[PDB]
Design a protein around this nucleic acid. Structure first.
Lengths: 521, 102
DNA sequence: CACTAATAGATTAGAGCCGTCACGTATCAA
DNA sequence: TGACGGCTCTAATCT
DNA sequence: TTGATACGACTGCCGAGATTAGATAAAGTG
């Protein structure tokens, strides 16, 4: 208890750089120790948010957490649920909603209202349909969408009940003004209904929640906010700012991260040639006036903006990406193809009869590294625009989750949604070969829909689990309650973090990843 | 009693009723809130002890579940008039009162 | 996985509401 | 504190 | 040639059925 409290103590002092906390190793008793110390810590200090991450739903200590809060609490104890928030899944939330509706668990404030009644009837019908779908052994995507719609209906019912009750109306429900009024109203008059609201929907007012116990899968697969419909991602939420995230079973937060990253990389594809030229036009848009200025300044400052642009303009003439490529197998990176430039055709060929091979194999990495640098620059500008927008719009910790910032930057620059997604995925990167530049596999294609050009489809992987841990280390600081490609790369971490590291096609991609990992080692 | 047997509809007859008071409300005198709380308002007709007819306006609000301690009213749509509810019945229940601003 | 339990009316008395303070047009007197 | 004046909900009174 | 006095102030319509192909799109465990 006191040992774990002292271990967690220095993290706040070391939060000047958001340090590592190593790996306190030991053989269920170890888990029960951290919950008591965390409860005492959160009770003692008012401004501190924990992010206890478990790995199994049963492993979550929802009963153990609650049987330790009052023990560490003084006479002026908090409302438990007002501070402790266990993030649950849509399925179990629906189950709990139905259970509360049936046997009057929910207070009469949301029972006397008829809209809540009809929403719960619709929810029950949708849950019966969901059970039938689950019995069908089918793709749970359609049924999940239907259930999410049904739950959004009752969620919106809660807002429309609370808005007219409080001193507000207008039914985003004033995401800067009336949201605060709703949260204030539900903090002073309610006695037991507030308890049910906090226990059932912890995300209603997340910023005031102290301890966030949740499984790793939900920790990496985003969460659905109460008022908003679209699910915000955990890794980018201002909630995670200056947080302390305990990683119980931290050894298991490697396979999940790697598996999610490989699916994310495979799912989002784009053409390298079109994506590069589109970015350069948007970059050239900045220099040449245009843009809303609010974003324009930051860009004109910080000189490197002009060097990335002259680099782009320089290599565009060298590789003629202004001219559309032409075709007449994967290409991994850490019988070959060439490319001339037949003026007659006014394009470049890439059929093998080596005429003027500029070593296209070196064309690929130059474009890749330019895209990496430009994306880091755009990420920095998006961070600046984020902090500015959030600072002028003082609010209740809810705005510009820095996925919106970069996507807005890319949409202003004249780029498609998929291109913006690829650019942000490349950008979010702010030593061995894999951990330095990673894998970048390219694949040519042809289609009768577009025969005069060949789409150089690019699959990019640069976010290894160690870099994910490093980014989580920039947003917040981790703990080490844990006890070849499933044990991270602790040596690389001790290299990078340094002073703060210690004290006390899916299959194909997988294979590729493992390989160079090994080579690097 | 004879008034209580009446109905709002044109060309009606004596229909038996158990409600002590005659409360007449149609579909025109009806509005909904943001909670979809159906709120009719009727026209109470009563002859007092000095044989004067009173036409006071009575407002009814919607309640989901039966209240065994309060009076429960149910709208008889066919006869166009409110009726007392002594036992739980299918339909939507109503209770006297108007707590909205307007 | 779980609920059971088992519940003033009727009639006045008053604060406070809305809502109506009529308007543009043919038309006979003076 | 436009104000008059009917009258509607609602707290009060009354078993 | 205008200053009275008695009356206008106008809301629409009103279902059944049958045929297609259409990228997508999350995050779960009793």
């Amino acid at each position: 208890v006191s040992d774990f409290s002292g271990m967690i103590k220095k993290l706040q002092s070391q939060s000047p750089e958001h340090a590592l906390m190593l790996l306190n190793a030991p053989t269920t008793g170890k888990s029960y120790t951290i919950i008591r110390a965390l409860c005492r810590y959160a009770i003692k200090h008012e401004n501190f948010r924990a992010f206890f991450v478990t790995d199994q739903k049963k492993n979550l200590k929802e009963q153990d957490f609650e049987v330790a809060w009052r023990e560490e609490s003084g006479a002026v104890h908090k409302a438990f649920s007002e501070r402790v928030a266990v993030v649950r899944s849509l399925e179990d939330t629906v189950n709990k909603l139905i259970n509360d509706w049936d046997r009057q668990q929910i207070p009469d404030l949301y029972r006397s209202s008829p809209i809540f009644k009809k929403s719960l009837e619709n929810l029950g019908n949708a849950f019966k349909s969901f059970g039938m779908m689950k019995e069908n052994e089918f793709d749970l995507k359609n049924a999940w969408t239907m259930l999410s719609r049904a739950e959004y209906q009752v969620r919106r019912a809660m807002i429309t009940i609370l808005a007219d009750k409080a001193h507000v109306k207008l039914k985003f429900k004033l995401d800067s003004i009336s949201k605060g009024k709703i949260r204030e109203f539900v903090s002073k008059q309610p006695k037991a209904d507030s308890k049910w609201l906090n226990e059932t929907y912890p995300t209603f007012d997340l910023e005031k929640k102290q301890i966030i116990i949740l499984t790793t899968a939900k920790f990496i697969k985003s969460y659905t906010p109460f008022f908003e419909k679209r699910s915000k991602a955990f890794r980018y939420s201002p909630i995670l700012k200056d947080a302390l995230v305990v990683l119980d079973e931290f050894d298991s937060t490697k396979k999940q991260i790697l598996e999610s990253a490989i699916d994310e990389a495979l799912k989002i594809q784009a053409d390298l040639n079109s994506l590069f030229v589109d970015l350069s036009k948007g970059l050239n848009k900045v220099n040449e006036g245009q843009l809303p200025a609010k974003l324009g300044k930051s860009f004109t400052f910080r000189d490197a903006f002009k060097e990335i642009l002259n680099d782009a303009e320089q290599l565009t003439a060298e590789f003629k990406l202004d001219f559309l490529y032409k075709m007449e197998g994967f290409v991994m990176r850490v019988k070959p193809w060439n490319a001339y430039f037949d003026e007659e055709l006014r394009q470049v060929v890439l059929g093998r009869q080596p005429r003027n091979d500029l070593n296209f194999q070196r064309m690929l990495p130059r474009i890749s590294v330019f895209l990496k640098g430009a994306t880091k620059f755009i990420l920095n500008r998006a961070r600046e625009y984020q902090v500015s927008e959030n600072q002028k719009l003082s609010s209740l910790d809810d705005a510009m989750t820095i996925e919106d910032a970069c996507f807005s930057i890319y949409a202003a620059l004249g780029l498609s949604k998929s291109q913006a997604k690829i650019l942000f995925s490349l950008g979010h990167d702010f030593g061995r070969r894999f951990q330095q530049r990673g894998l970048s596999l390219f694949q040519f294609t042809n289609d009768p829909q577009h025969d005069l050009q060949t789409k150089i489809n690019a699959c990019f992987f640069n976010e290894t689990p160690e870099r994910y841990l490093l980014n989580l280390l920039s947003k917040a600081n981790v703990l080490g309650l844990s006890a070849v490609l499933d044990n991270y790369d602790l040596g690389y971490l001790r290299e990078m973090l340094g002073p703060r590291l210690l004290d006390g096609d899916a299959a194909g991609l997988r294979s590729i990843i493992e390989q160079e990992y090994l080579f690097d080692a | 009693l004879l008034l209580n047997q009446q109905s709002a509809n044109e060309k009606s007859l004596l229909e038996p009723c158990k409600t002590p008071e005659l409360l007449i409300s149609g579909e025109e005198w009806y509005r909904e809130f943001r909670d979809m709380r159906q709120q009719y308002y009727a026209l109470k007709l009563k002859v007092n002890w000095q044989q004067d007819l009173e036409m006071s306006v009575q407002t009814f609000t919607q309640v989901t579940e039966f209240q065994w301690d309060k009076q429960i009213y149910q709208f008889d749509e066919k006869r166009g008039r409110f009726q007392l509810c002594y036992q739980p019945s299918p339909g939507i229940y109503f209770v006297q009162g108007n707590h909205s601003a307007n």
